[PDB]
């Protein structure tokens, strides 16, 4: 599923999102434009053999499991497959127990290099809330 702008921050915010650990609405919907496109079943292999899934792009060498990144770590308890539904709820819940792990939303090398630090209010402005 590909979600609309709005409908994707409303869908974060009624899953608890808001302010989560500080974290604006707003920073939360830019990282996922820039990390899936707002597609739920966005995935992208990286050099060292781990895979990024779904919405915000979560990685299967420390937060879920695919059966296939030999050494890794399954942290959020979850399969990989269940971070491209078409419910957001498996990724807010991984995302909120990564946003908690110590360096905060910098683990999204997008939202560092591309969210952090903007306007990100712009990309909430005129959603029915
Ligand atoms: C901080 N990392 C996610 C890289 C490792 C946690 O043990
Ligand atoms: C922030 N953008 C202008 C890119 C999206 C519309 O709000
Ligand atoms: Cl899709
Ligand atoms: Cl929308
Ligand atoms: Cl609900
Ligand atoms: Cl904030
Ligand atoms: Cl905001
Ligand atoms: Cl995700
Ligand atoms: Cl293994
Ligand atoms: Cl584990
Ligand atoms: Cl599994
Ligand atoms: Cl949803
Ligand atoms: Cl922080
Ligand atoms: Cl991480
Ligand atoms: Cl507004
Ligand atoms: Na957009
Ligand atoms: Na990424
Ligand atoms: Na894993
Ligand atoms: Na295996
Ligand atoms: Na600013």
């Not at 974290?23 to 496109?37: D, I, P, Q, T």
């Not at 498996?90 to 792990?101: E, F, G």
């Not at 999204?108 to 402005?125: E, H």
């Amino acid at each position: 599923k590909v979600f609309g702008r709005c409908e994707l921050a409303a869908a974060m915010k009624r899953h608890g999102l808001d302010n989560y650990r500080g974290y604006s609405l707003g920073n939360w919907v830019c990282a996922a434009k820039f990390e899936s496109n707002f597609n739920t079943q966005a995935t992208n292999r990286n050099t060292d053999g781990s895979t990024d899934y779904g919405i915000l792009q979560i990685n299967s060498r420390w937060w879920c499991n695919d059966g296939r990144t030999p050494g890794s770590r399954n942290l959020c308890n979850i399969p990989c497959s269940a971070l491209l539904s078409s419910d957001i709820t498996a990724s807010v819940n991984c995302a909120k127990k990564i946003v908690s792990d110590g360096n905060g939303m910098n683990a999204w090398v997008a939202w560092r290099n591309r969210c952090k630090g903007t306007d990100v209010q712009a990309w909430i402005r005129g959603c029915r809330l």
